[PDB]
Nucleic acid binder design. Structure first.
Lengths: 122, 56, 114, 209, 120
RNA sequence: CGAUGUCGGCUCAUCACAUCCUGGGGCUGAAGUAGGUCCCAAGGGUAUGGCUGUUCGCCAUUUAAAGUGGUACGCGAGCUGGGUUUAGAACGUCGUGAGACAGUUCGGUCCCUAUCUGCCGUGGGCGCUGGAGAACUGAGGGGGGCUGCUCCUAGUACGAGAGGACCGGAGUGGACGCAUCACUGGUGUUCGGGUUGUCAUGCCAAUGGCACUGCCCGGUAGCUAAAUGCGGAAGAGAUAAGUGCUGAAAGCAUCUAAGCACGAAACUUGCCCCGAGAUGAGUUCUCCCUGACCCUUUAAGGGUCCUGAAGGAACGUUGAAGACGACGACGUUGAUAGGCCGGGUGUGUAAGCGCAGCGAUGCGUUGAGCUAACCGGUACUAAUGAACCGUGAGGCUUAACCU
RNA sequence: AAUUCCUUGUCGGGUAAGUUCCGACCUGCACGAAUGGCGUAAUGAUGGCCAGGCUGUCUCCACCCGAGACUCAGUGAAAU
RNA sequence: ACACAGGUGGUCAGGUAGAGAAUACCAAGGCGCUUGAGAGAACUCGGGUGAAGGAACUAGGCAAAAUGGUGCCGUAACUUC
RNA sequence: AGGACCGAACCGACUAAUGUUGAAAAAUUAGCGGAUGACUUGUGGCUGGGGGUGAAAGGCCAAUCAAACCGGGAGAUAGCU
């Protein structure tokens, strides 16, 4: 499960295999992150085709978990990687032009549908 | 941190009052023979509950 | 008391397909999503036994591109369009956990066809 | 309005169209015999005794058999008492059933939790285990420091240590009536309740106008 | 702890209790009454009743069994011939327990275990 | 000074109130939202990451706050032991020098047969009085207590506007706390199957033991959290600060003196659990018993025989009840524990026989074979008559009724 | 700096930050050529700082096995 | 001090497996104990199991787990070659 | 060939854990390590009190040691207890 000091691959286009989870947020004491809810990330490698800097502090949201999406019936829909997508801290919204993720029901429960819907996978 | 002064001999009598061993009285007898046993084992004569269980 | 099993058979189906683990099940669903029904298809192999009445999980795994991509369907689920079993598996274990860390010719399943 | 008793058959998920999967607890309700009603000089109030089985007619004693003769001696599985106030009509002449819940939607259940009497600081009192390596001497399972030094001279009441767990009365209030059947004497309720599968549950209606 | 384990852990390691109760099964069929502690008399009933049930069928495929843990040269003709009609054909209840009293000079409870039928 | 462990690190308390946050609101250079300041209040609350012996400090991100103090600036018969404060080493300095040093680092122990006061579960007496049994009172104690996010009222009040609130009206979260095992994971050394080394049943097959449960691969029942369900209520009573009515001392005036009315996250209930040793030893219902004799002599005391109710105890079979005790189910007026029978879950198509293929191996008979906890069926094994304890209407009185 | 208070000097690099690490500098209150000077590899029961696998050290433990805690019998202490 | 988990000189080491004196089943050989019965809780000691995460723990990957055999391939800086 | 790489017998102290009124006058369990040497070892000797021995800690010198142990001067002396 995703938590503080976890290294992940990123769902943002031209993002590197390595970004670091520095805070799990929620204001109260928190163990692990949650799908469709925010997390604090630092960029540990930057790709020159991408739009981010190494060592920069950013806002993100969790978009796929090895724990799967499973609330309504207990029937799990599962993925073979843990990943988040990057959000702007003032203007809001996913900062990329493509997302590498399943873009499930709880991501369309956010204000983001216009920039995630190019490829629905479930 | 050690015992200072000796505990009372009435308190020794009361702590020893909690005994539960019995004088086994009366002992049970078989339905065909007046031979004694505790309420669930065989006699030392092979008699038990009017059934007879060990031959000679 | 067994009246709680009669309560699970209340929601179970009168007739349901059997395949057993490793078979190629070629599935279709209407999903409903608590809001709107729509046709979706999913294809892979069934990697778990059905099995315990109403709470049968019906777990299917795509096993492609070096990812497993696992999904629980439930065999008695009201959102199922069809199950179209078209190939046997050549497997002997029912839990199949060795397929979660293997790819291609190491996660092949094969056809039996015997 | 009084109360009723039945056995915890189990719990099974019922499923819903928009989520969640919802556990429903099933209660098998007995012919609650109404063995007694308290009236004359009984502390200015009225109360009924239910009875939850027939036990065995060979096992009875005369002080129980006479005390129950007014309805015949049965006294099985548990007696239990409920306060009879604002009930309008008298409970005697029929055995009480899930008809108590034919209009009611909310209930409170006294679950009686399954015993776990063995307890411990990690099992009961939610404390960690301390240092499996790096160095620690006989302080690996402890509720920390049980009292400050010198000046108090004594141990405080209400500390997070010792005692027993499970076997509490443990009420639950955030429940809902899912199905009633007066012909089968059967009750279904939403959510989980204390007490193991196969244990006896006490339930009373909850009402607010 | 033990919340569905109904097996008695008794005294000393499992591998002792195995060896001992597999030997005591051979000792019981030899003399048809044996004396020991009340706990040992009851713990000898475990898996030996299934072993008696196993000795009922006289088929050549069933004759392959009852042979892994308890062997003796003088049961070889009774096996798959007599243990059926004498015991296993009863369908359960192949033994009897009775406490005989206490052990000599000490507080240990003593009992005898016998087979449900005596030879005529 | 015949010997109070010191700094920092971990783990965990109790009291204040000089209030950081939470409830209340006053004054103001207070229109409104705010800021600045004031005091009624300690019931609930008051992070995390890097650097250092480390407090002290600094930095990054979180917050209703990132409050202060007492308790040897709380917790070594507490955990840790890097600094300071052991033997040895190694650098800078002063001195003729042993030494010395407002100069400094490397390696450096943390003991404890718990008596008494205390604390936390649990037996056994004495007691309410003739004995037993079933159950329930409430004098009193404990638990509980704060809060994040969003939406309606409402773009309402105030104000061109900018900006933007009380008041009550709901839904949804975390730490944290509780419960169940139903889902999802885990474990599950009474179990199904594969396999390397080897021994054993003559040998081969088939099959079992050992080698860490050999290696495992798995797992029912169970338990469990990382799983799921739920949680800190609504209401009532009474107050403080504070706001007031009516009004005399002060013919005016005045929250007070007489007499009336309101008010805070506080206070007390309600909630939830205990609770008559509440010796201030509560209360109803049901069950049972209708015997004589002797002595000193007496409304006191002692002895003898006769044979005993209601009920308990004893004993199993064993438990969802346990360290010992205490407690549940029932005991042939029998399903209390087990075996057996029909089946589940879980393993994986074996053996025996033949066939294809030099063969490994695969194929048919075969969804084979195998079973414990789960479900149902069954007296097949086991579960004393009842001994023993318990006896005979139970002392005095105030008041009424029945006789 | 094995030599340096204020000092974590002052600057650069690594880092969300870094009294630690790496590299420079001179203004060494007091290094200096046998009371030796300076540098180099395998190497070191050597010390500081990072990356990866692997992992119950930790989130957080949860359940087992073999031995003690319990109990009864036999033989039955010590410090105080 | 003891019929005490200790100390202690010389000679010997087969089969099957294996490089082997490692290591197991074994061989020849030996022993089944100088307290026994039972049980089983918070806790104490070691071993076994390990999901998802992983060095976050800690002064420190300490401790623990993973790696592990050898025939054929393929190999940096620095260097007293 | 080897003050050589790993490694039995052989040796042995570094980490960790258990033990600590013990089995124990220093062991036990697991691991890392020493193993042709500046080594180790069986057997018997030789080195002594300010003397020995020490690739040198005032460590070791039969548990003792900024000076061992026993027996004597010695019932030494104590403005003190």
């Amino acid at each position: 499960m995703i938590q503080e000091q976890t290294m992940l691959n990123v769902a943002d286009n031209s993002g590197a295999r390595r970004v670091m989870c520095i805070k799990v947020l929620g204001g109260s004491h928190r163990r692990y992150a949650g799908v469709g809810d925010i997390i604090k990330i630092t960029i540990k490698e930057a790709i020159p085709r991408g739009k981010v800097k190494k060592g920069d502090v950013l806002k993100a949201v969790v978009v796929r978990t090895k724990k799967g999406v499973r609330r309504p019936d207990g029937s799990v829909i599962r993925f073979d990687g843990n990943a988040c997508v990057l959000l702007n801290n003032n203007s809001e919204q996913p900062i990329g032009t493509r997302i590498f993720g399943p873009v499930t029901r709880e991501l369309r429960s956010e204000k983001f549908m216009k920039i995630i819907s190019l490829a629905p996978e479930v | 941190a050690v015992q200072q002064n000796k505990p009372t001999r009435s308190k020794r009598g009361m702590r020893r009052s909690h005994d539960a061993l019995t004088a086994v009285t009366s002992l049970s007898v078989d339905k065909t023979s007046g031979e004694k046993h505790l309420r669930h084992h065989i006699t030392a004569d092979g008699y038990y509950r009017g059934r007879k269980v060990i031959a000679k | 008391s067994n009246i709680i099993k009669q309560l699970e058979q209340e929601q179970m189906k009168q007739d349901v397909p059997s395949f057993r683990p490793g078979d190629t099940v070629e599935v279709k669903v209407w999903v409903v999503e608590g809001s709107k029904k729509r046709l979706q298809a999913f294809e892979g192999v069934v990697i778990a036994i059905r099995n315990r009445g109403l709470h049968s999980a019906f777990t299917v795994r795509k096993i492609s591109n070096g990812e497993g991509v696992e999904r629980v369907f439930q065999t008695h689920s009201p959102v199922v369009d069809s199950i179209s079993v078209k190939r046997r598996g050549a497997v002997r274990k029912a839990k199949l956990y060795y397929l979660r860390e293997r790819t291609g010719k190491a996660a092949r399943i094969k056809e039996r066809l015997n | 309005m009084i109360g009723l008793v039945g056995k915890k058959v189990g719990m099974t998920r019922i499923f819903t169209e928009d989520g969640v999967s919802i556990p429903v607890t099933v209660i098998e309700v007995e012919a609650n015999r109404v063995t007694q009603v308290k009236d004359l000089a009984n502390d200015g109030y009225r109360a009924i005794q239910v009875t939850t089985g027939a036990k065995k007619a060979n096992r009875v004693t005369k002080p129980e058999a006479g005390h129950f003769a007014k309805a015949g001696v049965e006294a099985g599985r548990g007696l239990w008492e409920f306060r009879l106030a604002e009930g309008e009509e008298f409970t005697v002449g029929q055995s009480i059933s899930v008809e108590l819940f034919a209009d009611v939607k909310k209930v409170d259940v006294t679950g009686t939790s399954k015993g776990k009497g063995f307890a411990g600081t990690v099992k009961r009192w939610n404390f960690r285990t301390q240092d499996a390596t790096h160095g620690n001497s006989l302080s690996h399972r402890v509720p920390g420091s049980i009292g400050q030094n010198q000046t108090p001279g004594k141990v405080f009441k209400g500390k997070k240590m010792a005692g027993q767990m499970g076997n509490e009365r443990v009420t639950v209030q955030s429940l809902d009536v899912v199905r009633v059947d007066a012909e089968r004497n059967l009750l279904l309720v939403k959510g989980a309740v204390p007490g193991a599968t196969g244990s006896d549950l006490i339930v009373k209606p909850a009402v607010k106008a | 702890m033990r919340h569905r384990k109904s097996g008695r852990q008794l005294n000393r390691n499992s591998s002792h209790r195995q060896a001992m109760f597999r030997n005591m099964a051979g000792s019981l069929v030899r003399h048809e009454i044996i004396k020991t502690t009340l706990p040992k008399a009851k713990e000898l009933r475990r898996v030996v009743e299934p072993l008696i049930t196993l000795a009922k069928t006289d088929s050549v495929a069933n004759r392959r069994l009852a042979f892994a843990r308890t062997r003796d040269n003088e049961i070889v003709a009774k096996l798959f011939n007599e243990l059926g009609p004498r015991f296993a054909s009863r369908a359960g209840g192949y033994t009897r327990i009775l406490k005989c009293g206490f052990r000599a000079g000490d507080n240990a409870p003593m009992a005898y275990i016998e087979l449900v039928d005596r030879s005529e």
